[PDB]
Each structure stands twice: as structure tokens, then as C-alpha cells.
Design an enzyme around this catalytic site. Structure first.
Site, short mmCIF file in Angstrom:
data_model
loop_
_atom_site.label_atom_id
_atom_site.label_comp_id
_atom_site.label_asym_id
_atom_site.label_seq_id
_atom_site.Cartn_x
_atom_site.Cartn_y
_atom_site.Cartn_z
CE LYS A 24 -0.93 -0.30 5.06
NZ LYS A 24 -1.90 -0.67 6.26
CB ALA A 28 -2.71 4.06 -4.06
CG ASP A 139 9.30 10.73 -3.82
OD1 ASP A 139 7.98 10.33 -3.83
OD2 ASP A 139 9.91 10.87 -3.15
N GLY A 143 12.59 2.84 -2.01
CA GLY A 143 11.38 2.21 -2.21
C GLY A 143 10.86 2.29 -3.57
#
Ligand SMILES: C[C@H](Nc1cc2c(-c3cc(Cl)cc(CCCO)c3)noc2cn1)c1ccccc1
Length: 261
Positions: A24, A28, A139, A143
Site C-alpha cells: 500500500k 492507494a 521523488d 522504495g
């Protein structure tokens, strides 16, 4: 409100079976989806329209899609069409089964120098494509550097990506990733969030002496206070760091847990 077991779209009129949960992000949620005809497997980013009740927020996603849509590169997550029903917006994506480089960093801490060479190269090669096509990610973090079954780096999550600060902020983030990969902890990482912003503004970091001089040099230039003195994407690949030492072309899956031999 339940996410439908099968996901059909008005356009392609294909049927997507919602399978195992994958993770998640904010509002979203991601599930492994399967095309019911071809049996091909995709990562389905499901966003509820209730989160996009405001038209301003409904723009942020349509921008993300318009940027990701246009993209095609073996180091950026493949886009495969989006759609919507009354309740959810569905973004069909390329399946990265080995999670993100964050999971790896957490499990591995400081990886080996050849591993950083391999991981950086592939990430930088993706970032190049982005920059060439006038796209800034803005960004970039571990991750967002996903991994598939062949340990190939695939850049994802274009939520703060833009099309033309400028290109040099992405070089900054890459400097952080290289730091974190080699050192084993993020350069401006602190418990307190406000402290991090101060550390960044004041440019307060320090590469431990244990790190390779040639590697520390590159990191420093990537993290330079003057954005115009940071190296260009093209200049990164050719750096001594990548060309002097050993650089594997492939990495085993074992790298997710233990160093390679
Ligand atoms: C194993 C799986 N694979 C996977 C996941 C994705 C995603 C994705 C979408 C959302 Cl809403 C949230 C997250 C979680 C990470 C937080 O950003 C990923 N988009 O595209 C993919 C392709 N593959 C995977 C799970 C966790 C991290 C990373 C990759």
C-alpha cells in the site's frame, strides 16, 4: 467498499482478476492482477475515487499517469493502460516480484561495492532516459527502485514527477541512494523530521573514512550544495567509480539477504 474480484475496463474490454495483496501507499493499494484471457500478470495500483473527491487531487494522478503513460524503458516500470469505474481508479503496471531496494537495504545494511555499482548503473541508466525525455522524477528513493525476478532495477512511483530546481535534484537523490547503499544508513537520517530538513539545508552530512576515496568523491559531488556543480546524468556513468572497480552485469537473488560470493 469492496474492490471487485474481477476488474474490467470500458476501453480494451479485458478482464483482470484481483489476486494476492502486494502492498500500500497513502490512499492507494496494490494487488497482483491477472489478465483472465492471456494469463499475463500485472501489478494493479488501485486508488479509491473517495480520495480524489477534490478535483485538485484528481489532477495529481492524471499528471502522474500522463507522464508514466508516455514512458518506455527497461529501467522504468512498464505502463500498461489505466481505467476507472465509479468507485476505483485502476493503474495496470509491470510486476516487480522482488520488492524495492529499500527491503534489500533493511535486510542487508551496507552492501558491497560491486553491488552498488550494478544497482546505481541501472538506476542512473533509467534516470538518463527520464532526463533525455525532459522528465524529472523529484521523488527518488530506495522504495521507488523496484526489483523483478532477474534483480533488474525498475524505477517506479512518478507521483511527484514533472515534465519541462530542475534536473539536478534527481542527481541529489541518487547521491543519497549511493550513500545509503555503501554506508548502510541514510546521510541525513534522524529521528526528528525537522532536524533532517535543517541537515539538508545546512548540507550537514559526513561520509565515514571507511568508504572508498573514489566513491566518497563521487558522492560528495552528487550531494554538492551548488546544484550547478553536481554532475550531469551522462557524467555519472563515466565516473571513475564505475569504470575502475569490478562491476557485475548480473546479480543473484541471494543479494536480497546475504552478500554475493
Ligand atoms: C512485490 C511488490 N511488487 C510490485 C509493487 C508495485 C507497486 C506498488 C504500489 C503501491 Cl500502491 C504500493 C507499493 C508498496 C511500496 C510503497 O511505495 C508498491 N507499483 O508497481 C509495482 C510492481 N511490483 C512490492 C511490494 C512492496 C514494495 C515494492 C514492491
Amino acid at each position: 467498499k469492496e474492490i471487485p474480484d474481477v476488474l474490467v475496463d470500458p476501453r480494451t474490454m479485458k478482464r483482470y482478476m484481483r489476486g494476492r495483496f502486494l502492498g500500500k501507499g497513502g490512499f492507494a493499494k496494490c494487488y497482483e492482477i491477472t489478465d483472465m484471457d492471456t494469463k499475463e500478470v500485472f501489478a494493479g495500483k488501485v486508488v479509491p475515487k473517495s480520495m480524489l473527491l477534490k478535483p485538485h487531487q484528481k489532477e495529481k494522478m492524471s499528471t502522474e499517469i500522463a507522464i508514466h503513460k508516455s514512458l518506455d524503458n527497461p529501467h522504468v516500470v512498464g505502463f500498461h493502460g489505466f481505467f476507472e469505474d465509479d468507485d476505483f481508479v485502476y493503474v495496470v503496471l509491470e510486476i516487480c516480484r522482488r520488492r524495492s531496494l529499500l527491503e534489500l537495504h533493511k535486510r542487508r545494511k551496507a552492501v558491497t561495492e560491486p553491488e552498488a555499482r550494478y544497482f546505481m548503473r541501472q538506476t542512473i541508466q533509467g534516470v538518463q532516459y527520464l532526463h533525455n525525455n525532459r522528465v524529472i522524477h523529484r521523488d527518488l528513493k530506495l522504495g521507488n527502485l523496484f526489483l523483478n525476478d532477474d534483480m533488474d532495477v525498475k524505477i517506479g512511483d512518478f507521483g511527484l514527477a514533472t515534465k519541462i530546481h530542475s534536473f539536478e535534484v534527481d542527481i541529489w537523490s541518487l547521491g543519497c541512494i549511493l550513500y545509503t547503499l555503501l554506508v548502510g544508513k541514510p546521510p541525513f537520517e534522524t529521528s526528528c523530521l525537522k532536524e533532517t530538513y535543517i541537515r539538508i539545508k545546512k548540507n550537514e552530512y559526513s561520509v565515514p573514512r571507511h568508504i572508498n576515496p573514489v566513491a566518497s568523491a563521487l558522492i560528495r559531488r552528487m550531494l554538492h550544495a551548488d546544484p550547478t556543480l553536481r554532475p550531469s546524468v551522462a557524467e555519472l556513468l563515466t565516473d571513475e567509480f564505475f569504470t575502475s572497480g569490478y562491476a557485475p552485469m548480473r546479480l543473484p537473488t541471494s543479494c536480497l539477504t546475504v552478500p554475493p560470493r
